[PDB]
Subunit: 262 residues, 3 copies
Amino acid sequence: VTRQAAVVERRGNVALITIDRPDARNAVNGAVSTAVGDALEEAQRDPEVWAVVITGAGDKSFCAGADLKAISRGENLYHAEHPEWGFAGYVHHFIDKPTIAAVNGTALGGGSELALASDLVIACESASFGLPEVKRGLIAGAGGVFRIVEQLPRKVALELVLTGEPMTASDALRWGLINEVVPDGTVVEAALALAERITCNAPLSVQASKRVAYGADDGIIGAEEPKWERTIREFTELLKSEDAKEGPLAFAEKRQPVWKAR
Amino acid sequence: VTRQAAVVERRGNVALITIDRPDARNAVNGAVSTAVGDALEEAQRDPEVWAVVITGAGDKSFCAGADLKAISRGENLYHAEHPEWGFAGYVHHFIDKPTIAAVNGTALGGGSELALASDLVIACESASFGLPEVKRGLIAGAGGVFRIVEQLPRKVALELVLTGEPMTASDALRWGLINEVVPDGTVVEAALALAERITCNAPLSVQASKRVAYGADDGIIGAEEPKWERTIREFTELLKSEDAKEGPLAFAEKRQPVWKAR
Amino acid sequence: TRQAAVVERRGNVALITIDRPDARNAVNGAVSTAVGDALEEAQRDPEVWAVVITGAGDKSFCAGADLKAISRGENLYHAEHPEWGFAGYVHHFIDKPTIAAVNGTALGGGSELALASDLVIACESASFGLPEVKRGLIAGAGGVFRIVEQLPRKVALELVLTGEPMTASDALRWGLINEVVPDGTVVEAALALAERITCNAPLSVQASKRVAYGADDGIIGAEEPKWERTIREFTELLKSEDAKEGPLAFAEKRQPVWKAR
Ligand SMILES: [K+]
């Protein structure tokens, strides 16, 4: 349809990005990655933008992950100029400005990966997080596996990765994986309120603090680059497997998959 | 003395390893390390083994740590062919398959190190963890010191390390050090049920995710290698100290140790 | 004429007290020199098996850097050892375990002392935080990079980026600190924690500390680039107009007007 895949708007010193494909549960195709990647670069460049909020349209889904139809059309899913930014033009796209994921609904797979890549997270009551890629014969290749082990206690993170089972918003708050849980429908105002508790502070201070906290130098987190390389390497090999073909196919006939370990 | 030191059983796609020296509280000698190390390597090589559970015989002790009579006889406590696998053929023995410690009783010292080396942990209600070596004149030389600081909040890990005091299974659960606490006597069934929520997933996805989670390349966790070197160097220096003999002599003469800091 | 810190021995424990309660135990050159020396002495002395640090009184553990001393152009570091950093403490690894006995408010520099310590006991009315971002500055004494290691990442970044405080009770719940005790009783509590450590083999405890931090020859290799990054960022930030506006507005009890330069 003749509509923008994601929209951007200003609220004071805040750039609000809304993934706007609610019929597709806010799944990410190339159009989304273009719009979100461009929006982030613009937020980076504009000295008057002091914080960023990303959210999904509607109340059912924050981001369902990569768009399965787009994948089957063999479409490019990444920013066309900057594939190095990774999934949604977002996960490997460091900027100085603080980013807040306003999780308005289900956030499984790529959706959790967006939250993990963000600095701060507010989720609504009915939101949930997880990396169910292992149930599908792939892996969370947009940073999920190596970032979850850093953002949850190791044993709890490994349970989540290895079983592919979801975590409720309430449990994520309890673990310190997210910052706040709010009523469904209110996530954007809650995120803006959090942003305003940051944009009241000295912007160069907030931004310098963000770089120090991450160990970022010239827009690159040095310690993460080998994790990206390892992930890319593991993912590529995985795709050669028959199981990586079987897994998506089974979910596309609602039957259980038959794993061969090859 | 003449039973297999550790026993292996298949349960579906799960290999179940039981340390089987209940009379010695499942303390580890060369025979245990040989059996456990062999079983891990076989689980690695068998493409039909998709998860491993390790446990100890009976309801009193998961693992008492190093066999002290074996140590006093100057015996080799490691796997005879693979001393590099370290304590029990286990703690420095990375395999692609998810490992679950089914902690059936006390797990102080080496017992905690098996738990720390495993991917996931289920404990019985009366189980306890800790690294009491500091009370004797040595350190946790099987990876316990550097892994517990990664698996508990820093200040909480440091208290456990420096005091040598135990942590209950319920507290471990609350911190996210372990995954589940179950009634005494049911830990094996509970670990197998957890394993079933892993072996239902695509095995190559699960194993690739494990490698990415740990940053493992060709069976080595590069980041841990200098931590092992440091641990072994420190441990060696302590073995030679006067205080390292005062510790056990004081526990034998049923008095308080008088430390000399040499 | 007065002494700024008090150093004493209790059994095998060295007890250090910042003693400027009228300045809310803010750190100047005299504090850093005395605190640095005491740590070095605790390191050298084989009978010192643990260290406790506290502030006098019940209002303030440590208010941070002394703003008068700064405005007077004074040196705030140990006179011989700038490399030890804030209070002679935050970049000064020793083999002996250290316990921060947080006797009251501990924002800014005070939270950095807690973060640099091995263990922390706080009174009920204590609070932690890094409000530097509200002043046009940053927590350049290790606070930003250590807080993200010692609290869950999302929770740490909230603290860092909002500059809002955290109560003793929430710090305990997260495992940032080890114990919360009634006001006025932090020193007895810190010494009791210390006695649960000095009962253990001193060489074991100290080797365990080294392994736990990855310290070789008194240096935590992994933290050096983080120090360098912090110093580089701090240095550049001081050149901005906002870095002057922040402390000026605070001194003038008004809201700062940020220019983002
Ligand atoms: K040991």
